[PDB]
């Protein structure tokens, strides 16, 4: 989960009354512009890239229908149900899957940084981050299962995968330091973090190269 | 102490010191901290060896006491090895039955070697019972007619040990052993229509009948278990003092002397005490109460079968029948697909025999015994194939088990102790059978594959499999740097297995480590 | 052709799979299109080398008597030219350089 | 089964569907059908076929509709006795294969 920003609504927002219009008398073809300047083409949650997709009211219209014309209240998320299918995580498996969840139990991207709660394991695993305690605990579990980014075996098995591809390529640096000059050396690490930006699943690749949040 | 001399002060002499000393030593045993039953004396066997047999010249095999494997791509060497076991332990199952009887006997015209200059064949084996009886022999043998000398058998040790569980059980009832065969014949039809109908099967020991036959016999179950049915809907002791109205009352009004009608009294009498004598006769062991025996079986099928939640017994128009719970919904067993049925008529025959052989157990699964199993994956898909060896294990804790496969899932769930190599030298022979190098027990199937079996992980038939190794060699001998004979590769790659596709991600990682981090390291030391 | 994640009996047409399977490697195949794990996770062994990455980083990168313990372990059970002892060490190695470089930071 | 009974006699029959097990447990109907469609080139595009059975013990029965099959089975044979032609080959290879 990158950290995102948000920026001015789309006009036509303004242009419906709760409760008076259904959700469904909006043209949607005038909104994914602005929710792809921001993304950049990945999804919200799990950070793959988006081919069959769909925008997600993240504080639910059933139970609170006032947010329904709310510009914070939307996210590009990925997979669909006007093509069929089983879908298995992200915004269905939240409604289908979960069960129970408090909506102020969840971490949001766009308000909080989930680097104060999440760590990825070489191994392709997340774990709640080291040293946490109960109430920062309590949001990094439930965020993990409402969303199963740990139990849908194909995301597993790529995420594991793209990481375990790199690691001969991490090696050969990071022990050429006694032969670099001291400013070289940062240059040799950052042609590296350039590149991620444009990559799957950037976040994992970047807990393999870093050393610190201080960049070098 | 030393049980044969315990049995010999006993026998002669006709004594209570030396009969108490014999069941003691049968019957002792503790509770684990997991709370499973443990028996001071366990029982198992220890080696095999084969001479001048069929293409064997002379080979020796070294058993483990829990849990053996056999591998190698040989179907028929390794079928003759679990045919010559069956044939020893015939001789211990005639003994427990009957006084004399006698066992299987090797076949003159198949079983020798057919250029041995010998001209004589033998088979040998070696058991242990616990530290008072640590060895006993066997051997079966014959030869060519027309020649100079004969050769016998060598059975004497084998029969005294069956002595001992027959003559203590008449006396005082007790525990006593299993053995099972499982063939790949077991896999056949089932026929609906069962009208047969006799009154054997519900004596203790019909659990020996067919027992080494191959396949088992799931028509016997289907009648011992609608049986417990209606004997247990309604209290048969009420059929008793039933009887006991014409037999006590007729009495008091045969008036007239005549043989005709106080013959009718006469028959109804002696046949309600020839009744109760049954009734009588079942107090003499401690046989369970058919609700428990019920009861138990029912557990078991439900907990090893992944599928299979609840079965019973009802009522149609004009008979009764078997129903199951499966997936969800409610079927009769003609409704099962072939994976589901097999592995059941497994499971249910086995079952039973052991609660019919262990009546003074708390649990009756956890006697002893040896089982044989064929081919163990047959109609299962890959998920199961990495949990059948967990599910049988924990269900019957003190069975010794001997098995054969080929699968490369089921090795990644046992320990390489466990396992046997079978690798015929030109015409056959070997002398030794071998264990690998690696360790099987929670390794990655991809390395199973090439080390333990051969083969390698993509299909070298394909023009499109090697053309990612081609690309390779051409970035290497322009030193790391691209050319058109490369760009072709890259965009076919490309074009056939996708965009995002390993194959591409792997490419892409040769390019970016091979120019710039080995490039600019070189020329700016240079 | 192929069946959905889950299913009743009320699916009404058929369709094919997304990746493609003509000469693609065997542990992949199993994994995208079957839906299984490369290696048994009810067996507790296969766990190991999580809990020692974890371990590890827990105290800043360096070894000690819990780790040291966890790491003979390993190499008793799978053997001293195995993958995953070529693995673990590879982790060690890095890790210091990673460390050595924030110090002199 | 329903071509193969026609090539070798005129007015031949093929197999059926059973009362006691092939109908849905649960259905609310009480009747089963299967249908299906083959090709013999740009001259005859389309060829219809289906079978059909109900529940015992039901009060009115579904029925079959086999005419198109009986139809194209005659052109195949009734040339044949005039002059010499090729035919089609249909075959099944099951598990019970494997018995001896
Ligand atoms: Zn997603």
Not at chain 2, 60 to 84: F, H
Not at chain 2, 153 to 179: C, G, H, M, Q, Y
């Amino acid at each position: 989960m990158r950290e995102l920003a948000r920026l001015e609504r789309p006009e036509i927002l303004d242009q419906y009354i709760a409760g008076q219009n259904d959700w469904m008398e909006i043209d949607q073809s005038a909104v994914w512009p602005k929710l792809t300047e921001m993304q950049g083409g990945f999804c919200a949650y799990c950070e793959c890239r988006l081919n069959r997709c769909h925008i997600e009211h993240f504080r639910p219209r059933g139970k609170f229908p006032a947010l329904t014309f709310i510009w914070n209240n939307l996210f590009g998320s990925c997979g669909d149900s006007r093509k069929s299918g089983g879908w298995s995580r992200c915004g269905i498996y939240k409604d289908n899957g979960a069960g129970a969840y408090n909506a102020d139990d969840l971490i949001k991207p766009d308000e909080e940084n989930p680097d104060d709660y999440l760590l990825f394991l070489t191994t392709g695993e997340v774990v709640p981050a080291i040293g946490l305690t109960g109430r920062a605990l309590k949001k990094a579990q439930e965020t993990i299962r409402v969303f199963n980014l740990n139990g849908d075996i194909k995301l597993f098995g790529s995420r594991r995968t793209a990481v375990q591809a790199i690691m001969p390529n991490v090696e050969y640096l990071y022990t050429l330091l006694e032969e670099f000059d001291e400013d070289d050396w940062n240059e040799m690490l950052r042609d590296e973090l350039e590149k991620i930006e444009s990559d799957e699943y950037k976040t994992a690749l970047k807990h393999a190269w870093t050393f610190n949040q201080e960049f070098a | 102490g030393n049980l044969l001399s315990a049995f010999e002060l006993y026998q002669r002499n006709s004594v209570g010191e030396w009969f108490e000393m014999c069941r003691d030593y049968i019957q002792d045993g503790h509770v684990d901290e997991s709370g499973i039953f443990r028996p001071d004396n366990a029982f198992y066997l220890r080696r095999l060896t084969l001479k001048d047999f069929r293409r064997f010249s002379l080979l020796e095999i070294k058993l483990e006491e829990d849990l053996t494997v056999i591998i190698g791509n040989n179907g028929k060497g390794k079928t003759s090895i679990l045919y010559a076991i069956a044939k020893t332990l015939s001789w211990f199952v005639a003994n427990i039955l009957k006084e004399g009887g006698s066992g299987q006997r090797l076949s003159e015209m198949t079983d020798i070697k057919n250029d041995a200059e010998d001209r004589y064949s033998d088979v040998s084996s070696t058991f242990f019972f616990g530290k008072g009886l640590k060895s006993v022999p066997i051997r079966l043998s014959r030869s060519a007619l027309g020649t100079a000398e004969r050769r016998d058998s060598e059975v004497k040790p084998a029969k005294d040990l069956a002595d001992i569980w027959r003559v203590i059980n008449e006396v005082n009832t007790i525990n006593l052993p299993t053995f099972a065969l499982y063939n790949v014949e077991r896999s056949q039809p089932f026929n609906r229509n069962i009208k047969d109908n006799t009154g054997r099967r519900e004596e203790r020991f019909d659990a020996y009948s067919q027992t080494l036959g191959g396949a088992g016999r799931f028509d016997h179950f289907v009648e011992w278990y609608i049986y417990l049915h209606k004997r247990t809907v309604s209290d048969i002791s009420s059929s008793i003092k039933e009887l006991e109205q014409q037999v006590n009352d007729l009495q008091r009004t045969v008036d007239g002397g005549m043989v005709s009608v106080k013959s009718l009294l006469e028959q109804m009498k002696f046949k309600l005490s020839e009744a109760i004598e049954r009734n009588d006769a079942a107090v003499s062991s401690r046989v369970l109460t058919e609700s428990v025996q019920k009861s138990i079986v029912e557990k078991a099928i439900c907990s090893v079968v992944p599928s299979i939640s609840n079965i019973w017994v009802e009522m149609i128009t004009g008979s009764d029948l078997v129903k199951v719970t499966n997936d969800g919904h409610d079927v009769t067993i003609d409704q099962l697909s072939d994976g589901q049925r097999v592995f059941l008529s497994l499971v249910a025959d086995l079952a039973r025999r052991m609660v019919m052989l262990n009546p003074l157990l708390e649990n009756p699964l956890e006697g002893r015994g040896i089982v044989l199993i064929d081919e163990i994956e047959l109609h299962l898909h890959p998920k199961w194939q990495q949990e059948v060896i967990l599910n049988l294990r924990s269900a019957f804790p003190n069975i010794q088990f001997i098995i054969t496969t080929h699968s490369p899932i089921v090795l990644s769930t046992i320990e390489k102790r466990c396992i046997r190599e079978f690798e015929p030298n030109d015409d056959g022979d070997q002398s030794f059978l071998d264990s690998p190098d690696m360790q099987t027990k929670g390794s990655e199937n991809a390395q199973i594959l090439e080390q333990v079996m051969n083969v390698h992980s993509t299909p070298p038939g394909i023009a499109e499999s090697h053309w990612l190794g081609n690309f390779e060699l051409l970035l290497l001998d322009n030193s790391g740097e691209l050319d058109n004979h490369s760009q072709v590769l890259y965009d076919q790659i490309k074009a056939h297995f996708g965009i995002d596709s390993i194959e591409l991600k792997k490419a892409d990682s040769l390019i970016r480590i091979n120019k710039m981090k080995n490039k600019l390291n070189k020329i700016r030391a240079e």
